[PDB]
């Protein structure tokens, strides 16, 4: 029986930096060194036996200075952050070690920042791959050549560009508490971060990267890769499938023990534990035995150690991806597994009344990630729950909108908004944010905050009345209409004038409301000091209460005066104050508030 399993390796990195390309290159190095053998096929993963790793490296195996008793490496077929947030029954990432892929030319990017913080919160050891070193200007490319061999073909101009870009890499890594270095320059691999310049498109430096993966995983996970084949199986759901012929099945990576087609398992949902019995296990047939792409699967009796397997069983409809699968041989084992899963749900999901946002995600691991990314930026949270954005979320964000409009929003990560909820989100003006990555969904929300705050200022200026003094012309020649409405040529003495504003005399009597401001054939929305324009005044009649030559003042309220002097002070020019003080001397004869100008 087996002594030690293989480590489960995941691949992280920013989009287009070369995650899937590197995974593709490692499957290619499998066939070139396959050497007359069927390699254990997995559902959702690809195994690389150490016989391939050793012969691919050749004499470079000696760079690790320690024999590798591992049987192989199990690489996850789906890369990225979202795959990494799949967490075990013990809160840890199912990846035993990660590979951070960073484009050497593009450098550090948001998802690089995103993954590094996760790699530290999960305490996961990892290697950094400086990818795309072929786009270095003037680079000598040789297919499937180890990096230490390939660098000897380079000129000083190219090596300089590599050493310079590594320098910026290590600086960013040190800016996150990681001592980074080129791999052949690292002395202590447990106190330092190793960087392997690779070319995932041409296979340059893949030999050195696999040697570091195999070596590090052994010296970091010697003890817990030594699983007993015999123990019950513990796994993590990678995907939930409503298969056409197989019904509801879950794609799972088993990270501990042996799973049997007879086993009773406890499956993690979004709000409950699923106790069911396995009906059938399925794995891919040996690679040569495939003749129809529609029939690639065998019925298996047992899978053990690290294995990707498809589990067909009843009740898996409510199973949640990223949640654990726990085999339970006894009712006590069933009862304990139900506790660990619900304790995991109670620790992530939050339901409160505090004035905050509402967070919805696809899996538990990503829900905890975004909910704490918001806690980094000190954004309160009213609820975080796994599921699609329902109607009753919009109603809860509606109550938050009525309290603080800044937090009456919804943040959904990799989640589709319900049909019955999208109309409610527009009928109540509840902002919904849909995204696939965490950093952008926070930025889009924060960009919305800047928009809304600056709209709040715009609406305030539009609602306040500004001060202004005008004077009617004395000639009967500037009287264009004597009633309904009175249209008279004026000059604005001080401040500014605007339509909808009411006017008063020197004795503080309302004469009418300004219908429109007109200069030449044009219509204006305001007129500032020094402009001679014609204004229409509703309710006023020339000669009745207003007279040519008379000085008129914009009628202001105590609210308008307080707002300008204490909140909009930076918008008042010298003419605006003089207008305001001139109005206050008129309004002081009746209201002694204006004695404070």
Ligand X SMILES: Nc1nc2c(ncn2[C@@H]2O[C@H](COP(=O)(O)OP(=O)(O)O)[C@@H](O)[C@H]2O)c(=O)[nH]1
Name 3's Cβ contacts closer than 8 Å, sequence gap at least 6.
69, 226
- Does 134 show up as a binding residue in the annotation? yes
106 vs 526 by CB, closer to ligand X: 106
Nearest to 169 by CA among 99, 100, 238: 100
What DSSP letter does each residue of 312-376 carry, written as one string?
E-TTGGGB-TT-EEEE-SSHHHHHHHHHHHHHHHHHH-EE--SS-EEEEESSHHHHHHHHHHHHH
Give the residue with the Cβ less far from ligand X, 19 or 529: 19
Q: How far is the CB of 24 from ligand X (least distance, A)?
A: 8
Phi-psi region of 217 (alpha: psi -120 to 50; beta: other; left: phi over 0): alpha
155 is in an annotated binding site: no
CA atoms lying within 13 Å on the CB side of residue 301:
0
Contact call for residues 267 and 345 (beta carbons, < 8 A)? no
The CB-of-205 to ligand X minimum distance in angstroms stands at 10
Task: Closer to ligand X by CB, 13 or 268: give it.
Answer: 13
Please, what is the minimum distance in Å from the beta carbon of residue 169 to ligand X?
16
User: Minimal distance in Å, beta carbon 20 to ligand X?
Assistant: 3
Quote the tokens at residue 442: 């926070």
Single out the residue of 10, 12, 22 nearest to residue 201, CA to CA: 22
591 annotated among ligand-binding-site residues = no
Nearest to 163 by CA among 475, 171, 142: 171
Coil vs helix vs strand at 423? helix
Residue closer to ligand X, measured from CB, 46 or 465: 46
On whether 133 is known to bind a ligand per the annotation, the reply is: yes
16 or 573, CB closer to ligand X?
16
Q: Is 79 annotated as a binding residue?
A: yes
Q: Are 597 and 580 in contact (CB under 8 A)?
A: yes
Q: At its nearest, how many Å lie between ligand X and the CB of residue 145?
A: 13
Sign of CA dihedral 210, 211, 214, 220: negative
Q: From CA 368, how far away is CA 122, in angstroms rounded?
A: 12
User: Residue 193 and residue 15: Cα distance in Å, rounded?
Assistant: 22
Q: Least separation, in Å, of the C-beta of 201 and ligand X?
A: 3
In the complex with ligand X, the residue whose CB is nearer, 141 or 148, is 141
14/270 with CB nearer ligand X: 14
By CB under 6 A, name the binding residues for ligand X: 13, 15-21, 131-132, 134-135, 199-201
> Minimum CB separation from ligand X for residue 448, in Å?
28
Strand partners, 528: 496
Annotated binding site for GTP: 77-81, 131-134
């Amino acid at each position: 029986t087996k002594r030690i399993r293989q480590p489960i390796i995941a691949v992280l990195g920013h989009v287009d930096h070369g995650k899937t390309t590197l995974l593709d290159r490692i499957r290619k190095t499998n066939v070139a060194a396959k050497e007359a053998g069927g390699i254990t096929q997995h559902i959702g993963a690809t195994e690389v036996p150490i016989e391939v790793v050793k012969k691919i490296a050749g004499p470079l195996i000696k760079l690790w200075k320690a024999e590798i008793k591992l049987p192989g490496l199990l690489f996850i077929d789906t890369p990225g952050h979202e795959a990494f947030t799949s967490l075990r029954a013990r809160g840890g990432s199912l990846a035993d070690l990660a590979v951070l892929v960073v484009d050497i030319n593009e450098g550090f990017q948001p998802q690089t920042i995103e993954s590094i913080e996760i790699l530290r919160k999960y305490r996961t050891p990892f290697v950094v791959a400086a990818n795309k070193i072929d786009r270095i200007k003037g680079w000598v490319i040789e297919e499937d050549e180890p990096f230490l061999m390939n660098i000897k073909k380079q000129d000083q101009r190219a090596v300089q560009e590599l050493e310079t870009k590594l320098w910026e890499l290590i600086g960013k890594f040190y800016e996150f508490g990681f001592q980074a270095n080129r791999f052949d320059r690292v002395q202590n691999f447990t106190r330092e971060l190793a960087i392997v310049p690779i070319s995932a498109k041409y296979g340059i430096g893949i030999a050195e990267l696999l040697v570091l993966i195999a070596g590090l995983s052994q010296r970091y996970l010697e003890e817990k890769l030594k699983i007993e084949v015999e123990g019950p199986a513990r796994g993590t759901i990678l995907e939930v499938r409503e298969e056409p012929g197989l019904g509801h099945t879950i794609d799972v990576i088993i990270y501990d023990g042996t799973l049997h087609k007879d086993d009773t398992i406890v499956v993690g949902g979004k709000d409950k534990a699923i106790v069911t019995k396995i009906r059938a296990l399925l794995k891919p047939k040996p690679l040569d035995e495939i003749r129809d792409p529609r029939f690639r699967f065998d019925y298996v009796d047992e899978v053990t150690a690290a294995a990707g397997v498809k589990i067909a069983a009843p009740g898996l409809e409510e199973a949640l991806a990223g949640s654990p699968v726990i085999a339970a041989p006894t009712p006590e084992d069933v009862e304990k597994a139900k506790q660990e899963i619900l304790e995991q749900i109670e620790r992530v999901v939050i339901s409160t009344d505090k004035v905050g946002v509402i967070v919805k995600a696809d899996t538990l691991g990503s829900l905890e990630a975004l909910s704490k990314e918001l806690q980094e930026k000190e954004i309160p949270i009213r609820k975080a729950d796994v599921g699609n954005v329902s109607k009753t979320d919009v109603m809860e964000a509606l109550s938050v909108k009525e309290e603080e409009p800044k937090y009456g929003v919804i943040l959904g990560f990799n989640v589709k908004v319900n049909e019955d909820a999208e109309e409610v989100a527009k009928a109540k003006d509840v902002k919904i944010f849909v995204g696939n990555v965490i950093y952008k969904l926070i930025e889009d929300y924060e960009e919305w905050v800047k928009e809304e705050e600056e709209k709040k200022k715009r609406e305030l200026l539009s609602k306040v009345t500004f001060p202004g003094v005008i004077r009617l012309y004395p000639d009967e020649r500037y009287v264009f209409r004597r009633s309904n409405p009175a249209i008279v040529g004026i000059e604005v003495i001080e401040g500014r004038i605007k339509p909808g504003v009411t006017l008063i005399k020197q004795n503080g009597q309302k004469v009418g409301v300004i219908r429109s401001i007109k200069s030449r054939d044009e219509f204006l929305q305001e007129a500032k000091k020094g402009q001679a324009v014609a204004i229409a005044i509703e309710g006023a009649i020339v000669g009745r209460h207003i007279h040519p030559g008379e000085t008129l003042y914009v009628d202001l309220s105590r609210d308008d005066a307080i707002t300008l002097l204490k909140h909009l002070r930076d918008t008042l020019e010298d003419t605006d104050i003089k207008a305001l003080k001139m109005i206050a001397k008129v309004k002081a004869k009746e209201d002694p508030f204006w004695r404070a100008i």
